[PDB]
Scaffold this active site. Sequence first.
Site, PDB file in Angstrom:
ATOM      1  N   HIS A  32       0.746  -1.008  -0.043  1.00  9.82           N
ATOM      2  CA  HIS A  32      -0.060  -0.056   0.068  1.00  9.82           C
ATOM      3  C   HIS A  32       0.951   1.054   0.144  1.00  9.82           C
ATOM      4  CE1 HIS A  32      -2.915   2.676   2.108  1.00  9.82           C
ATOM      5  NE2 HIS A  32      -3.752   2.488   0.999  1.00  9.82           N
ATOM      6  N   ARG A  33       1.138   1.942  -1.019  1.00 12.41           N
ATOM      7  CA  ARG A  33       1.665   3.162  -1.311  1.00 12.41           C
ATOM      8  C   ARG A  33       3.253   2.633  -1.073  1.00 12.41           C
ATOM      9  NH1 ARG A  33      -2.146   7.064   2.568  1.00 12.41           N
ATOM     10  NH2 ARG A  33      -3.819   6.090   2.026  1.00 12.41           N
ATOM     11  N   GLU A  44      -3.758   3.112  -9.124  1.00 12.60           N
ATOM     12  CA  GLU A  44      -5.329   3.702  -9.098  1.00 12.60           C
ATOM     13  C   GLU A  44      -5.803   4.897 -10.057  1.00 12.60           C
ATOM     14  OE1 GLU A  44      -6.627   3.662  -4.866  1.00 12.60           O
ATOM     15  OE2 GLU A  44      -8.337   5.226  -5.315  1.00 12.60           O
ATOM     16  N   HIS A  61      -1.230  10.286  -2.922  1.00 15.94           N
ATOM     17  CA  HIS A  61      -2.452   9.637  -2.860  1.00 15.94           C
ATOM     18  C   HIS A  61      -3.549  10.701  -2.565  1.00 15.94           C
ATOM     19  CE1 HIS A  61      -5.580   8.862   0.205  1.00 15.94           C
ATOM     20  NE2 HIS A  61      -5.580   7.716  -0.211  1.00 15.94           N
ATOM     21  N   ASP A 116      -1.160   5.495  -6.497  1.00 14.75           N
ATOM     22  CA  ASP A 116      -2.086   6.580  -6.648  1.00 14.75           C
ATOM     23  C   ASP A 116      -1.939   7.504  -7.519  1.00 14.75           C
ATOM     24  OD1 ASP A 116      -3.803   5.171  -4.576  1.00 14.75           O
ATOM     25  OD2 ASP A 116      -2.560   6.098  -3.056  1.00 14.75           O
TER      26      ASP A 116
HETATM   27  O1  LIG Z   1      -5.690   4.363   0.812  1.00 12.31           O
HETATM   28  P1  LIG Z   1      -7.329   4.372   0.978  1.00 12.31           P
HETATM   29  O2  LIG Z   1      -7.787   4.842   2.355  1.00 12.31           O
HETATM   30  O3  LIG Z   1      -7.411   5.598   0.050  1.00 12.31           O
HETATM   31  O4  LIG Z   1      -7.866   3.307   0.541  1.00 12.31           O
HETATM   32  C1  LIG Z   1      -7.588   2.413  -0.696  1.00 12.31           C
HETATM   33  C2  LIG Z   1      -6.531   1.750  -0.961  1.00 12.31           C
HETATM   34  O5  LIG Z   1      -5.354   2.653  -1.395  1.00 12.31           O
HETATM   35  C3  LIG Z   1      -6.637   0.633  -2.027  1.00 12.31           C
HETATM   36  O6  LIG Z   1      -6.488   1.372  -3.366  1.00 12.31           O
HETATM   37 CA   LIG Z   2      -5.160   3.556  -3.409  1.00 14.58          CA
END
Ligand SMILES: O=P(O)(O)OC[C@H](O)CO
Ligand SMILES: [Ca+2]
Length: 259
Positions: free
Chosen positions: A13-14, A122, A55, A42
Amino acid sequence: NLLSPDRILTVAHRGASGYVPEHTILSYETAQKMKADFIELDLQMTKDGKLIVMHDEKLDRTTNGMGWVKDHTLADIKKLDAGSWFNEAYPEKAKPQYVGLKVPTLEEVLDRFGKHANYYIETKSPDTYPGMEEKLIASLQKHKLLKPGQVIIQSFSKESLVKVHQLQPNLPTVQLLEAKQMASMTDAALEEIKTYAVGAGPDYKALNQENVRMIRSHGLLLHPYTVNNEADMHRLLDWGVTGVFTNYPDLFHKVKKGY
Ligand SMILES: O=P(O)(O)OC[C@H](O)CO
Ligand SMILES: [Ca+2]
Ligand code: NA
């Protein structure tokens, strides 16, 4: 193989954002070293139309800049410090080498890893940044990325993924779902997701054994976000998820060995 239901995927995640400032080359490098299956990006678009990885729509949280990404040029964004915020937010995890880390472009991330990474990218609703999907696709083609599973496209926007599925039918998409969307999920909604998407990515807080089995019943991959706690990792895998978005890819790599 990467898209096999029987394969449990580690999506960083990131990047390895539990340890390194999110969405930096260093965060992705670290995720790679930690054996993540995917690095997660993102996208935002600058004033001069360039795709960068960030993000938020605003520079405020993760840089020493201020304002909307789309109000600033790439050149000005590349002058920013995208690492020091992390040292301030998490004093106990701070490292001197994080001072002065840069915002990367999508181009820079693809160029850095080429085929050596798998990308989880994303997009936004098409009206947010007109031309984003087309520019993303053309970038993936430039780097010869369009192994099925090399790239997965994710979005909260059905419209974006429907559009992507139109343009590139063999490009795997995953539908992101907010907690309340997942809470009120039906079979009808899942079956149509299957028509353009290979999987679903819901807020893990909204999952239970029942709706997990339901999602899996439609032959959908299931990657909840954002799963950072070891106890939650175990629970979700026993229930039957097929991967997670995590800030701690090394931890999930360890846990998933039992499933
Ligand atoms: O990081 P969030 O809180 O925007 O949740 C989405 C995750 O990155 C999965 O794309
Ligand atoms: Ca994301
Ligand atoms: Na700031």
